[PDB]
Structure formats: structure tokens, C-alpha cells
Amino acid sequence: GLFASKLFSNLFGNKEMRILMVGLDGAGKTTVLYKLKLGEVITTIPTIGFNVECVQYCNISFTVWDVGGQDRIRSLWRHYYCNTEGVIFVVDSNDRSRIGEAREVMQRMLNEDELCNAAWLVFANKQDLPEAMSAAEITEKLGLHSIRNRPWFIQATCATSGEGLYEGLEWLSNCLKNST
Ligand SMILES: Nc1nc2c(ncn2[C@@H]2O[C@H](COP(=O)(O)OP(=O)(O)OP(=O)(O)O)[C@@H](O)[C@H]2O)c(=O)[nH]1
Ligand SMILES: *SCC1=CC(C)(C)N(O)C1(C)C
Ligand SMILES: *SCC1=CC(C)(C)N(O)C1(C)C
Ligand SMILES: *SCC1=CC(C)(C)N(O)C1(C)C
Numbered sequence: 077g078l079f080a081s082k083l084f085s086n087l088f089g090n091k092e093m094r095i096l097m098v099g100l101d102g103a104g105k106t107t108v109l110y111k112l113k114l115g116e117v118i119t120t121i122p123t124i125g126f127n128v129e130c131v132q133y134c135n136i137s138f139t140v141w142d143v144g145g146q147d148r149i150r151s152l153w154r155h156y157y158c159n160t161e162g163v164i165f166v167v168d169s170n171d172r173s174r175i176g177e178a179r180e181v182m183q184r185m186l187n188e189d190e191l192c193n194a195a196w197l198v199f200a201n202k203q204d205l206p207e208a209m210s211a212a213e214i215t216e217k218l219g220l221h222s223i224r225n226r227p228w229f230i231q232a233t234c235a236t237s238g239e240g241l242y243e244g245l246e247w248l249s250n251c252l253k254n255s256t
């Protein structure tokens with residue numbers, strides 16, 4: 077009775093994963109979310125609020141909400157509505173000038189008690205740019221090797237084409253597998 081009823085409870089919980097997309101106002105959170113969700117790159121613009129996206133992958137229903145990464149939006153991050161199982165931090169690779177802003181911004185999100193249970197998947201955007209930063213530089217500067225207190229990873233992605241985007245959704249789904 078205890079085990080059975082449990083298996084019945086997962087019916088309205090399993091097969092569905094919650095995702096969040098945020099960060100800097102110039103990283104390209106909107107560009108990627110639309111590429112993996114719509115499969116095609118469209119005209120992106122500064123998002124002033126949040127935008128949910130229903131996408132299906134491997135029989136699962138990944139929900140990716142894209143909230144403005146701007147400073148003025150930073151506060152809005154506390155209106156996610158508690159549900160995101162994993163987050164997707166977008167960091168511009170070709171923009172070394174702000175490379176510290178993105179790093180410092182994620183820290184604020186990572187230092188939040190209200191977000192100490194959500195994931196932090198980092199995806200270096202603008203990788204398609206001829207001067208796109210390598211994973212070694214973005215990782216080192218971000219203290220990836222020095223940070224082992226929060227589940228976060230760095231991945232090189234190109235939203236303009238969408239390469240590597242699929243792999244990201246696959247890596248996350250494996251990390252939870254419900255049981256986790
Ligand atoms: N070439 C290229 N440009 C990109 C890519 N992702 C974003 N951009 C550029 O970034 C700008 C818009 O990106 P956004 O998706 O609005 O960036 P954001 O992280 O959503 O920031 P806000 O929406 O302002 O909070 C445009 O100039 C796009 O061309 C990418 O993968 N490749
Ligand atoms: S997830 C698709 C979705 C739901 C609803 C709000 C009903 N709209 O029709 C869109 C397509 C945005
Ligand atoms: S979720 C795994 C999946 C199902 C199916 C369509 C049968 N394919 O084999 C993949 C691996 C895409
Ligand atoms: S996280 C707050 C909230 C959301 C929902 C899943 C509907 N829960 O029932 C509560 C009210 C705790």
C-alpha cells in the first residue's frame with residue numbers, strides 16, 4: 077500500500093522536468109531557448125519579463141522560462157513561481173568585457189537560499205563567433221575548478237545554429253532521472 081500509492085503519485089510528476097533560463101541581458105538566453113524549443117533561430121530582442129516554453133524531449137516535458145537578465149530584471153528572478161528543477165546560465169563567450177558581470181551575476185543567484193535547490197547549467201553563447209572564447213578560458217575565469225559547492229557546468233554552445241543545444245538538455249535529464 078505504501079509503495080503502490082507512491083508509484084501512483086509519480087504519475088503526475090514523472091516524465092516532466094522544469095527548467096529556467098536567465099543571466100545577462102546580452103548572453104542570448106532567448107536565442108538558445110527558442111532554438112531548442114522551436115528548432116530554428118528567430119529575431120531575438122531584449123526580454124522585459126519572463127517567457128515560458130513547452131518543449132518535449134525523450135518523452136519528457138522540459139519547461140524553459142526565460143526571464144530578463146538585465147539588472148532591473150534581477151529582482152524579478154524571485155517570481156519564478158518555485159518549480160524550476162534546473163537552471164541554464166547564459167554567458168557571452170565573445171564578450172570578455174562583461175565576462176565578469178555574468179560571473180558575478182550567477183554568484184548572486186547561486187548564493188540565494190531561495191535558489192539553493194535549483195541547478196546551474198552554464199552555456200557559453202556566441203561560440204559561433206570567429207573570436208568565440210574557448211571552454212578553457214570561460215571555465216577558468218569562472219572558477220569552475222574552484223567551485224564544488226553547487227551543481228554547475230560549462231558548455232560551449234551556438235544558438236545561431238543550435239549545435240550542442242540538444243546535448244545540454246540530455247545531460248540535465250540524466251542528472252535527475254527522477255530518483256535524483
Ligand atoms: N551570432 C549569434 N548571435 C547571438 C546568439 N545568441 C544571441 N545572439 C545575439 O544576441 C542578441 C539578442 O540576444 P538575447 O537572446 O536578447 O540575449 P538575452 O540573454 O535574452 O538578454 P535579454 O533578452 O536582453 O535579457 C542579438 O544581437 C543576437 O544576434 C548566438 O548564438 N549567435
Ligand atoms: S505550451 C504552448 C502554449 C500554451 C498556450 C498559452 C495555450 N499557448 O497556446 C502557447 C502556444 C503559448
Ligand atoms: S527518449 C530516447 C528515444 C526514444 C526513441 C525515439 C525510440 N529514440 O530511440 C530516442 C533515443 C530518441
Ligand atoms: S512553491 C509554493 C507552492 C507551489 C505549489 C506547488 C502550488 N505548492 O502547492 C505551493 C503552494 C507550496
Ligand SMILES: *SCC1=CC(C)(C)N(O)C1(C)C
Pocket residue numbers: 188189190191192193194
Ligand atoms: S534552496 C532550498 C531551501 C532553501 C532553504 C530554506 C535555505 N533550505 O536550505 C532549503 C534546502 C529547504
Ligand SMILES: *SCC1=CC(C)(C)N(O)C1(C)C
Pocket residue numbers: 250251252253256
Ligand atoms: S545528477 C548526476 C547523476 C545522477 C545519477 C543518475 C543518480 N548518477 O548518480 C549521476 C552521477 C549520473
